[PDB]
Design a protein around this nucleic acid. Structure first.
Lengths: 75, 316, 48, 48, 100, 151
DNA sequence: CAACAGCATGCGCGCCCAGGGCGTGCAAAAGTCGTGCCAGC
DNA sequence: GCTGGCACGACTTTTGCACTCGACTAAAGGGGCGCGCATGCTGTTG
């Protein structure tokens, strides 16, 4: 599911410069390791996976913070 | 400065550079990378020599770290790009190069492991008794040996010596009537005059040593120091820096200033018929030299004929 | 005894590059020893 | 991808491994400049 | 807007008597001076027009503006004065190699 | 790096000929003065105690030698750059700053109200800075690392 | 006849490649050829 | 018992070391420009 336009994920988080930070911090997880995608993979690279999960509203700064606190508390 | 192609550099890659590049990219641990970096510097532009193993182990300063750890790692390093790399002794070189024959090579795998692993020390001369050792006969062993002789040695494929390091000559010796005549082909002005005087001393050397004669007539630096009255070290420095050029046997002339060289020519003549006897007889040649009037008595003059990678001693 | 790290010695994190005059003493703090002769590389030995 | 030497290596090794992460360092050519200004009697040093 | 940096100070009390100062720093020092119980610490200033090459060369960070135009001059003012860069703009960050 | 030790400390032309001249305006001298007397030419009366030439000033070197013979007394003048080092060494910014403040009050000309402020903001920079002015003319010259001068 | 203000001349910035192109003794110390001695086959 | 390698000696080769200034007679280049800042000489105000 190639993304031509990011606007839909930019409405989710204002200022795309923020999007890029969150997108890549989320994609890094799946890229290097120790995460699995919240969305069905369409064969696409991990970057698009991340932007899709942001466009779906499943992932954001707050959500990644809550997941970080949950993973640190569970460890 | 910049914006021009200043001779900033090329950054070429040698063999050790490339091996280290190859280590960077392989799944070594923190320690194993230290052993690997420890081995790749031990390697030489010639490949095979990884020098002493137990100094590789002891160089790390104990604290555990056995021999086996450097041995395994060592093997894997020996497996990198230029096929057989490092190892030791050429034997294990040919066993690592022989490690990959695809195993689909007819007759080669087994026979090659026997010949290359053990008894290869006797394969130098010829087959002979070895044919009775391995029970092989005819061309079965000869084809395996064709493969062993088809292997090549170590690395020297990385190389990175495109520079031939040419001579560029300095002074040309135009050959005259069975001899040589100078022409000099190809403060700072005072240095140039000194170089011209060095060329003049080479011309005096033409008068000092006969060209046509075997080797060169024996001369002393006191002759060239007699002609222009220059100091010995200065003349030897001019002849050491610059290299004289002649149509035949051109050389820095530093060796041109008939002595041992004539004996070397005589040794070369003896070498031509020396093929019949592998051991050779420089001592007998020394007796012949004494009969000729040289008075050589198993001296290094004969020993030089018996040295210089001569068949003498090595054949014995 | 080894575990020898050239790459790890400089991670140096800085701010504000600073600038000033160099005293002869600070020059000599940088100095590895003195160059006393003009010539560069011997033309025979091909070593410095 | 130009003058960071340790960082070019780490970069390419992580790429071959699928990391896509940078580990940026300090580019050579800055270091050079600092030596070339030290070559006049000016020190320029990086203060933490 | 960037030509209007660099005001010129009529009155005392803020130190810096009668010379080219940042308008920013002057408005910050006068703001802090009015915040203090002493209101005479504030001074009147006059803004200056600069003129865009003058205004580059006059930048607080000695690393930029060295690399703009005049390098000898720049580095001599900086070497004698002993100024620190702070790395706060985009060219410095580039030349050091860090994010902007 | 490397370094080389200089017999007679000289030059550093980076200062002095980068206009304006810090050595010129620091010592209250024209750059034709100091520029002229760096190498050869004048003898640059330095200290000049018990000397007919003003403790600070220059003179014709041949005339100065004749003047010294006429004086019958010897004045520690330095023809080389060592007089700039000596003068430069004997200069105190705080004493100069007090003199400059008196001079600024003394001056009735705005033209004179600018130069003075230049010297205040300069010398003041040397005080708060912590650099010694001496350092400007250099003794030990550092040499650049070999690999960045390739052959 | 005093210092002060103005006009003018000179010098150093920029732009920008651009192409390479390159002897004079004597004397103390040491490298090497010669010769002999010792070890290997 | 013979050959080859190496050790000891002689020789003959290598190396010490540098100051004066030496100079030397030309060898040429060579159509922008602005802009500004400072030094210097002139000029007019009292």
């Amino acid at each position: 599911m190639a993304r031509v336009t990011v606007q839909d994920a930019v409405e989710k988080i204002g200022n795309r410069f923020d999007l890029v930070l969150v997108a890549a911090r989320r994609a890094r997880q799946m890229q290097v390791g120790g995460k699995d995608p919240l969305v069905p993979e369409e064969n696409d690279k991990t970057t698009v996976i991340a932007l899709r999960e942001i466009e779906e509203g499943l992932i954001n700064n707050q959500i990644l913070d809550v997941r970080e606190r949950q993973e640190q508390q569970e460890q | 400065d910049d914006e021009l192609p200043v001779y900033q550099g090329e950054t070429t890659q040698t063999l050790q550079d490339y091996l280290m590049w190859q280590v960077e990219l392989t799944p070594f641990t923190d320690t194993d990378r230290a052993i690997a970096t420890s081995i790749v510097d031990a390697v030489d532009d010639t490949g095979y020599l990884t020098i002493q193993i137990e100094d590789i182990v002891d160089s790390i300063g104990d604290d555990e770290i056995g021999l086996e750890e450097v041995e395994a790692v060592l093997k894997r390093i020996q497996r990198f790009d230029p096929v057989g790399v490092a190892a030791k002794d050429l034997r294990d070189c040919l066993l690592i190069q022989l490690s990959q024959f695809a195993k689909e090579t007819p007759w080669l795998e087994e026979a090659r492991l026997i010949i290359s692993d053990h008894l290869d020390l006797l394969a130098n001369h010829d087959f002979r008794t070895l044919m009775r050792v391995t029970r092989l006969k005819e061309e079965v062993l000869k084809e395996a040996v064709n493969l062993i002789q088809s292997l090549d040695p170590r690395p020297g494929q990385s190389i990175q010596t495109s520079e031939p390091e040419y001579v560029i000559p300095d002074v040309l010796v135009r050959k005259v009537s069975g001899r040589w005549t100078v022409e000099l082909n190809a403060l700072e002005s005072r240095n140039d005059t000194l170089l011209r005087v060095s060329r003049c001393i080479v011309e005096q050397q033409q008068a000092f040593f006969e060209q046509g004669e075997e080797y060169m007539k024996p001369m002393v630096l006191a002759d060239i120091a007699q002609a222009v009255e220059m100091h010995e070290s200065t003349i030897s420095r001019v002849t050491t820096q610059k290299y004289l050029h002649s149509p035949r046997g051109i050389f820095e002339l530093k060796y041109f200033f008939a002595s041992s060289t004539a004996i070397r020519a005589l040794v070369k003549k003896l070498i031509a018929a020396e093929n019949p006897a592998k051991p050779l007889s420089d001592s007998k040649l020394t007796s012949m030299l004494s009969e000729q009037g040289i008075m050589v008595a198993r001296r290094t003059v004969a020993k030089y004929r018996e040295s210089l990678s001569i068949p003498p001693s090595n054949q014995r | 005894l080894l575990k020898f790290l050239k790459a790890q010695t400089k991670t140096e994190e800085f701010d504000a590059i600073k600038i000033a005059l160099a005293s002869p003493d600070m020059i000599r703090s940088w100095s590895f020893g003195e160059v006393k002769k003009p010539e560069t590389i011997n033309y025979r030995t091909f070593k410095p | 991808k130009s003058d960071d030497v340790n960082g070019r290596t780490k970069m390419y090794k992580n790429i071959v491994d699928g990391n896509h992460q940078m580990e940026p360092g300090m580019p050579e050519s800055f270091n050079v400049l600092l030596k070339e200004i030290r070559s006049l009697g000016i020190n320029i040093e990086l203060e933490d | 807007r960037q030509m209007l940096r660099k005001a010129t100070i009529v009155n005392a009390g803020s130190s810096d008597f009668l010379e080219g100062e940042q308008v920013e720093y002057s408005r910050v020092k006068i703001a802090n001076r009015e915040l203090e119980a002493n209101g005479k610490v504030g001074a009147t200033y006059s803004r200056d027009l600069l003129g865009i090459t003058k205004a580059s060369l006059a930048t607080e960070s000695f690393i930029s503006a060295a690399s703009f135009q005049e390098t000898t001059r720049v580095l001599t003012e900086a070497a004698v004065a002993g100024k620190r860069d702070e790395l706060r703009g985009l060219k410095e960050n580039v030349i050091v190699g860090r994010l902007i | 790096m490397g370094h080389i030790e200089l017999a007679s400390p000289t030059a550093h032309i980076w200062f002095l000929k980068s206009l304006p001249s810090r050595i010129g305006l620091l010592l209250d001298m024209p750059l034709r003065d100091i520029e002229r007397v760096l190498y050869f030419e004048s003898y640059v009366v330095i200290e000049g105690g018990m000397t007919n030439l003003e403790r600070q000033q220059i003179l014709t070197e041949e005339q100065y030698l004749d003047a010294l013979e006429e004086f019958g007394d010897e004045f520690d003048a330095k023809m080389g750059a060592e007089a700039i080092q000596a003068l430069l060494k004997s200069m105190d910014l705080e004493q100069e700053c007090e003199q400059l403040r008196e001079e600024l009050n003394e001056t009735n000309s705005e033209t004179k109200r600018k130069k003075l402020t230049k010297r205040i903001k300069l010398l003041e920079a040397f005080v708060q800075s912590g650099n010694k002015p001496e350092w400007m003319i250099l003794t030990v010259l550092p040499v650049l690392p070999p690999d960045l001068r390739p052959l």
